[PDB]
């Protein structure tokens with residue numbers, strides 16, 4: 692309502708900054724509170740005025756355009772000067788990989804695993820409509836809130852997260868075990884390489900957060916995929932869900948389903964599982 696108004700910009704002093712989240716493995720992300728509204732938030736910060744600002748501002752610009760119940764929601768930015776902030780809603784249960792690894796399986800039961808996949812595929816159907824290619828879909832980049840609410844996020848983890856997850860490839864660092872063959876071979880990323888990664892994420896969900904391709908060296912993964920090797924069906928994984936994994940891992944990207952198709956399939960399976968679950972709960 693005045694000349695320098697920007698509807699997304701907030702004053703840094705609006706936010707109480709608290710501790711760093713993720714132990715450094717997730718970069719410069721902090722818990723905060725939006726004081727005026729007594730609301731816990733998460734805040735990504737960039738302290739210095741360097742070339743890193745270009746990607747930080749690109750991230751903020753994308754987040755202003757995307758909005759969906761299962762995408763982490765932008766609340767505001769501080770991008771007029773350093774230190775730069777991106778402020779989002781707070782997801783109380785943290786990243787999905789550790790959630791799965793730490794959960795009570797009587798609570799996070801078969802129907803909840805389907806619910807998780809359904810929510811993620813709904814977010815990805817939306818990103819497919821926007822034609823936003825995520826490039827690093829994996830359980831480590833999803834977040835969990837109350838009542839098993841799951842949202843897709845992106846923490847730009849490839850040079851933050853240490854260990855075997857990301858390794859040197861094509862002058863960058865790739866999560867080899869989530870990467871579609873044509874992305875490994877030709878650096879070709881697309882909605883269909885996100886579909887491949889979603890299939891790996893389904894396997895992470897089915898195994899309560901196991902690392903993929905167990906015991907297989909990173910150096911061998913591409914060669915094996917090219918011979919048509921694919922991960923086996925996890926114990927307890929429904930056949931229909933494994934069929935969807937295998938569809939996501941079609942060698943030719945054009946042969947992989949769309950996220951619209953994937954989401955419809957999961958919504959159907961989830962509603963069926965929910966009926967059985969509600970009946971079982973009602974009994975006693």
Ligand SMILES: Cc1cn(-c2cc(NC(=O)c3ccc(C)c(/C=C/n4cnc5c(NC6CC6)ncnc54)c3)cc(C(F)(F)F)c2)cn1
Pocket residue numbers: 712713717720733734735746749750753754757762763777778779780781782783784785786825834843844845846
């Ligand atoms: C270049 C570029 C990047 N992108 C792109 C960026 C994003 N950015 C974020 O996701 C994002 C941004 C900023 C922040 C503060 C956060 C953190 C949120 N957060 C909420 N609860 C927690 C939390 N709870 C634990 C209990 C403590 N622990 C840690 N973090 C937490 C997440 C998302 C997407 C997507 F995927 F398309 F949506 C695309 C687009 N072009």
